[PDB]
Amino acid sequence: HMKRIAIVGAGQSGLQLGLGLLAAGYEVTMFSNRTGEDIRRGKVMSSQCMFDTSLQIERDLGLDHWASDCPTVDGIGLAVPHPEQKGAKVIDWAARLNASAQSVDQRLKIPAWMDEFQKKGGELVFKDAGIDELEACTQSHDLTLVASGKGEISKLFERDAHKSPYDKPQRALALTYVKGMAPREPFSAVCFNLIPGVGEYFVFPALTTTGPCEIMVFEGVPGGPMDCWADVKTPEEHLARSKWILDTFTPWEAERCKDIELTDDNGILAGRFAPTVRKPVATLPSGRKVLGLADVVVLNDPITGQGSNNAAKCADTYLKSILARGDGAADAAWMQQTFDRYWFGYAQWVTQWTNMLLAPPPPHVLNLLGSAGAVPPLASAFANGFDDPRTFFPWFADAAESERYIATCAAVA
Amino acid sequence: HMKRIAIVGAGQSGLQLGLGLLAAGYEVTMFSNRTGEDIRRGKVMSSQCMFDTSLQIERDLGLDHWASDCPTVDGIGLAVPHPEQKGAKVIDWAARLNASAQSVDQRLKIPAWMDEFQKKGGELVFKDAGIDELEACTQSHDLTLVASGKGEISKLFERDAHKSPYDKPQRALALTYVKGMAPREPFSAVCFNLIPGVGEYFVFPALTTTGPCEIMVFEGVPGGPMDCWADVKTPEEHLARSKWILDTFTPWEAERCKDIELTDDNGILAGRFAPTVRKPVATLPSGRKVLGLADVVVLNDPITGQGSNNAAKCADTYLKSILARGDGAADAAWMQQTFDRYWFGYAQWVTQWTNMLLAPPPPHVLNLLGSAGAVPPLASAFANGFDDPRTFFPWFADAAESERYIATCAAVA
Ligand SMILES: Cc1cc2nc3c(=O)[nH]c(=O)nc-3n(C[C@H](O)[C@H](O)[C@H](O)COP(=O)(O)OP(=O)(O)OC[C@H]3O[C@@H](n4cnc5c(N)ncnc54)[C@H](O)[C@@H]3O)c2cc1C
Ligand SMILES: Cc1cc2nc3c(=O)[nH]c(=O)nc-3n(C[C@H](O)[C@H](O)[C@H](O)COP(=O)(O)OP(=O)(O)OC[C@H]3O[C@@H](n4cnc5c(N)ncnc54)[C@H](O)[C@@H]3O)c2cc1C
Ligand SMILES: c1ccc2[nH]ccc2c1
Ligand SMILES: c1ccc2[nH]ccc2c1
Ligand SMILES: c1ccc2[nH]ccc2c1
Ligand SMILES: c1ccc2[nH]ccc2c1
Ligand SMILES: c1ccc2[nH]ccc2c1
Ligand SMILES: c1ccc2[nH]ccc2c1
Ligand SMILES: c1ccc2[nH]ccc2c1
Ligand SMILES: c1ccc2[nH]ccc2c1
Ligand SMILES: c1ccc2[nH]ccc2c1
Ligand SMILES: c1ccc2[nH]ccc2c1
Ligand SMILES: c1ccc2[nH]ccc2c1
Ligand SMILES: c1ccc2[nH]ccc2c1
Ligand SMILES: c1ccc2[nH]ccc2c1
Ligand SMILES: c1ccc2[nH]ccc2c1
Ligand code: NA
Ligand code: NA
Numbered sequence: 001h002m003k004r005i006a007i008v009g010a011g012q013s014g015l016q017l018g019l020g021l022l023a024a025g026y027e028v029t030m031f032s033n034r035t036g037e038d039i040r041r042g043k044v045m046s047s048q049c050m051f052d053t054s055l056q057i058e059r060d061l062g063l064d065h066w067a068s069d070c071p072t073v074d075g076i077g078l079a080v081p082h083p084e085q086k087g088a089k090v091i092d093w094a095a096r097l098n099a100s101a102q103s104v105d106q107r108l109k110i111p112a113w114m115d116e117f118q119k120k121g122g123e124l125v126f127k128d129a130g131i132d133e134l135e136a137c138t139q140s141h142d143l144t145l146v147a148s149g150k151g152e153i154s155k156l157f158e159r160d161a162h163k164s165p166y167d168k169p170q171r172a173l174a175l176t177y178v179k180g181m182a183p184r185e186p187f188s189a190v191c192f193n194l195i196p197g198v199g200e201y202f203v204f205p206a207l208t209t210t211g212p213c214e215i216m217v218f219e220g221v222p223g224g225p226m227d228c229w230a231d232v233k234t235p236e237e238h239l240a241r242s243k244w245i246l247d248t249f250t251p252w253e254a255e256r257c258k259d260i261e262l263t264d265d266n267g268i269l270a271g272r273f274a275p276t277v278r279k280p281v282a283t284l285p286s287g288r289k290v291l292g293l294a295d296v297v298v299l300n301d302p303i304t305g306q307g308s309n310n311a312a313k314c315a316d317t318y319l320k321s322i323l324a325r326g327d328g329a330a331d332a333a334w335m336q337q338t339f340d341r342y343w344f345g346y347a348q349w350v351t352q353w354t355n356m357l358l359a360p361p362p363p364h365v366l367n368l369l370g371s372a373g374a375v376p377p378l379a380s381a382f383a384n385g386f387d388d389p390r391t392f393f394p395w396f397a398d399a400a401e402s403e404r405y406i407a408t409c410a411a412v413a
Numbered sequence: 414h415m416k417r418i419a420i421v422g423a424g425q426s427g428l429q430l431g432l433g434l435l436a437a438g439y440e441v442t443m444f445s446n447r448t449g450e451d452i453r454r455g456k457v458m459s460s461q462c463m464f465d466t467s468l469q470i471e472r473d474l475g476l477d478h479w480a481s482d483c484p485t486v487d488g489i490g491l492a493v494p495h496p497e498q499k500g501a502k503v504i505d506w507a508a509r510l511n512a513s514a515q516s517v518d519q520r521l522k523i524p525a526w527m528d529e530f531q532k533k534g535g536e537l538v539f540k541d542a543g544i545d546e547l548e549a550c551t552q553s554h555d556l557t558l559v560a561s562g563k564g565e566i567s568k569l570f571e572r573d574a575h576k577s578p579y580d581k582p583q584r585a586l587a588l589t590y591v592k593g594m595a596p597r598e599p600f601s602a603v604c605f606n607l608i609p610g611v612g613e614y615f616v617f618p619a620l621t622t623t624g625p626c627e628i629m630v631f632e633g634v635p636g637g638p639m640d641c642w643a644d645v646k647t648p649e650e651h652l653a654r655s656k657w658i659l660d661t662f663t664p665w666e667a668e669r670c671k672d673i674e675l676t677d678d679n680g681i682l683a684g685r686f687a688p689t690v691r692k693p694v695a696t697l698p699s700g701r702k703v704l705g706l707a708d709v710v711v712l713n714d715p716i717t718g719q720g721s722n723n724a725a726k727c728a729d730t731y732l733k734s735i736l737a738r739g740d741g742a743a744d745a746a747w748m749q750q751t752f753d754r755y756w757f758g759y760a761q762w763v764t765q766w767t768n769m770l771l772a773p774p775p776p777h778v779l780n781l782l783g784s785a786g787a788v789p790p791l792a793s794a795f796a797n798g799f800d801d802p803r804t805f806f807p808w809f810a811d812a813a814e815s816e817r818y819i820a821t822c823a824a825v826a
Pocket of ligand 15 (some may be wrong): 778
């Protein structure tokens with residue numbers, strides 16, 4: 001009678017997909033390796049800035065439960081320190097987003113969606129799932145998906161070397177969730193601070209388990225002055241190192257932080273990983289097959305702020321493919337084509353752009369970013385491209401095309 | 414109080430946009446150069462095969478008025494004549510679409526949407542609009558759009574030479590709407606017949622003013638054996654020349670046509686045009702500005718079946734941009750950014766792919782099309798790519814990437 005879907009991994013993409021499937025009349029089994037409460041009170045996992053298109057995917061499913069309470073992010077700003085004048089910027093501009101972005105802590109969203117999943121009839125099973133659970137799921141369900149993010153079981157899927165130009169981390173990452181930051185005026189924004197040869201500091205308002213906050217995101221070229229977390233062993237030390245980066249590299253941002261505190265002692269993170277794309281179909285010892293979802297198959301560095309946007313868009317594409325398939329077999333071909341539509345239609349572009357941004361920038365890029373400060377339509381294109389990075393091609397990557405786009409923008413300024 | 418939008422040109426994109434704007438509470442003025450009835454009873458304009466994503470845009474607006482009555486197109490087929498054996502094919506395969514396509518004659522859809530537009534409160538003005546009407550609209554409306562398709566006033570917009578690699582027609586076109594064709598079994602499809610060095614014949618079921626039909630689409634390399642319409646001066650002669658092409662080049666299709674008749678004497682068309690992209694902002698003598706929509710700014714050869722899909726997607730992107738803008742100015746910068754989002758996010762890919770397909774194919778393409786006949790997942794990717802041609806990049810265009818995609822497909826077959 002009823003089609004039955006198993007999802008291993010209770011994360012953003014898995015739960016969005018599972019909730020959509022329940023609403024469409026499927027039976028859904030989901031495995032989680034943590035309780036909701038331990039997720040709420042555990043370490044942060046991301047900075048999860050979702051732009052309008054991803055937000056709308058959630059709205060269309062009825063899952064925008066924090067829309068009113070979560071602060072809106074209304075623009076993007078970009079600043080570059082002056083090579084000469086201390087504490088001055090040589091580039092400093094901003095542009096409004098055509099529609100707001102929002103960052104709802106996954107510590108809030110994932111547990112609440114787990115609650116909703118059970119209320120809507122999903123079967124939530126608690127276990128650190130392994131091969132045995134995948135073998136069991138594939139015998140009792142029409143389709144089994146792995147949605148375990150950066151978890152170890154994700155390595156069941158073969159690395160796709162041609163889609164993975166990097167095999168090492170390209171940035172040392174850290175997150176710091178704080179209260180008390182002076183609000184940005186006259187509108188909120190993701191404040192991008194690009195430190196040439198050193199790294200990046202991004203900061204924006206968000207909602208966490210103690211209410212509204214701002215999230216500080218730090219990325220450092222490995223071995224550089226912002227690869228600076230190895231000796232940090234306490235929350236107090238993490239807050240202090242966060243303020244040290246701002247004092248040292250972005251004193252204009254330190255002026256907003258004279259009174260910041262951590263939201264909670266678990267509102268901190270540091271780590272690193274190599275960008276990786278994996279093949280989406282994994283074969284179990286039995287010969288049965290499972291399909292990878294979102295970060296299991298496409299894992300990008302957070303520098304472009306796309307992971308949670310990718311997660312929403314991936315789960316949307318997979319849900320649409322399931323609903324269209326009907327009673328057709330969920331075989332390896334269908335699985336692969338489902339991933340291919342996500343990859344070739346969308347994620348290949350997000351991934352190529354993110355991987356290029358991790359490398360040292362060519363000269364036409366500096367000209368582009370500086371020109372944006374004098375050409376508001378170009379600044380606007382930069383800001384709104386974060387909602388659909390396909391719109392950056394080819395002009396972000398090619399000098400001649402970048403000059404042509406600057407000219408188009410200047411002509412309507 | 415109310416924002417007011419003028420649209421010059423009562424075509425598919427203009428009417429979809431106008432109806433969406435009325436539903437959102439805007440005042441809309443629209444200019445048409447023909448009455449609804451003369452459109453219904455006049456010459457056909459297109460073959461308007463719309464794939465699922467475009468169909469869903471219409472559904473989401475409540476405009477899928479023919480969904481139940483229009484025959485569904487459930488797949489794509491590809492056939493290539495054998496160079497040796499007479500009347501045989503060396504390639505002949507098909508694949509199912511993940512969701513049906515539909516072709517509702519614009520002679521039906523445009524007049525019915527004009528009726529709906531008036532019923533929903535739009536102001537429909539009948540005049541062959543010129544500069545004077547654009548000058549008048551721009552004084553009395555917040556935003557004026559030109560949606561006149563292949564009409565002469567579209568030339569108010571400057572040709573974009575960098576986005577327009579062609580300045581001459583690349584195919585001699587013809588359309589023939591017929592009754593009596595044997596239905597394709599066991600499922601309907603767009604039957605692609607590629608005649609190397611000569612042209613293309615496509616055929617699929619559709620709905621017109623006399624009910625269900627099939628549409629024959631002919632494209633001929635200029636000066637070749639299928640550039641064969643210049644001496645056709647009557648409907649009877651047009652039907653006969655249509656059957657001659659099938660008898661001569663695709664006798665397997667002629668077997669379905671032993672009993673075909675025209676749906677009506679105006680169910681025929683022949684012509685040609687150069688693919689053209691235009692700059693989207695036009696400046697009137699007064700200095701006020703107007704924004705071009707759909708075929709006014711991006712006009713592709715029909716060979717890839719995308720014009721009406723582009724029209725729906727363009728009007729969707731423009732409607733979303735208007736709704737997000739609120740009371741912000743509809744200035745040249747906003748106009749340009751609205752087009753840019755359509756172009757860089759979507760249409761640049763449809764356009765580049767369509768323009769490459771008009772040129773003689775490189776060897777890796779023949780290998781790809783032949784391999785699809787032995788690799789069903791690749792045939793499926795080919796078919797479903799017509800719903801989002803971004804999914805064809807880069808593997809349709811690059812030999813090495815084409816070989817990699819064939820390998821991915823063969824591994825899950
Ligand atoms: C520092 C940092 C900052 C980021 N900032 C942003 C940002 O600003 N914007 C943005 O869009 N993205 C951002 N991201 C990325 C984004 O958070 C992720 O890409 C997103 O969470 C991916 O969703 P997912 O559903 O694939 O995985 P997740 O949401 O991580 O879900 C995976 C879940 O599976 C569980 N799991 C693992 N193994 C198992 C197992 N064996 N059995 C059962 N369950 C298991 C895990 O516990 C976890 O809860 C950031 C990431 C990092 C690291
Ligand atoms: C032979 C052929 C086959 C095709 N087959 C397909 C297919 O299979 N699939 C597909 O998706 N697309 C196909 N197309 C393309 C598709 O039909 C068009 O791209 C689509 O109609 C574009 O919509 P539009 O709204 O931009 O223009 P239209 O829908 O053409 O609307 C333009 C309207 O503006 C009116 N107008 C012109 N000048 C003025 C003026 N001065 N004042 C007022 N009104 C004016 C015109 O009379 C017309 O009604 C085909 C095209 C051709 C020529
Ligand atoms: C170019 C522009 C700005 C810069 N700040 C520090 C180095 C450097 C180089
Ligand atoms: C190790 C790594 C990074 C650092 N930045 C400043 C001091 C320092 C030490
Ligand atoms: C939005 C945009 C870019 C970003 N980089 C890191 C976090 C983040 C959020
Ligand atoms: C994806 C594809 C086909 C399917 N048949 C039953 C469930 C299911 C999921
Ligand atoms: C966002 C993130 C990193 C970047 N490096 C250069 C531009 C840029 C934008
Ligand atoms: C193109 C290539 C490499 C790059 N690194 C940062 C921006 C950028 C653009
Ligand atoms: C992020 C977004 C767009 C961009 N264009 C050039 C560099 C770059 C970085
Ligand atoms: C290659 C394949 C098929 C063909 N039919 C006619 C010429 C030709 C060339
Ligand atoms: C002119 C053009 C094309 C043609 N195909 C067959 C005869 C003929 C004449
Ligand atoms: C669908 C797909 C391709 C096509 N080429 C011409 C008409 C047509 C319809
Ligand atoms: C597009 C953009 C801004 C606008 N303000 C009023 C109407 C309108 C349309
Ligand atoms: C559709 C239309 C034209 C084409 N030429 C080669 C492949 C192909 C597909
Ligand atoms: C790449 C380049 C040119 C082409 N002509 C027909 C198919 C095709 C693909
Ligand atoms: C149409 C669609 C996809 C394609 N891949 C190679 C040629 C070609 C034509
Ligand atoms: Na300043
Ligand atoms: Na046959």
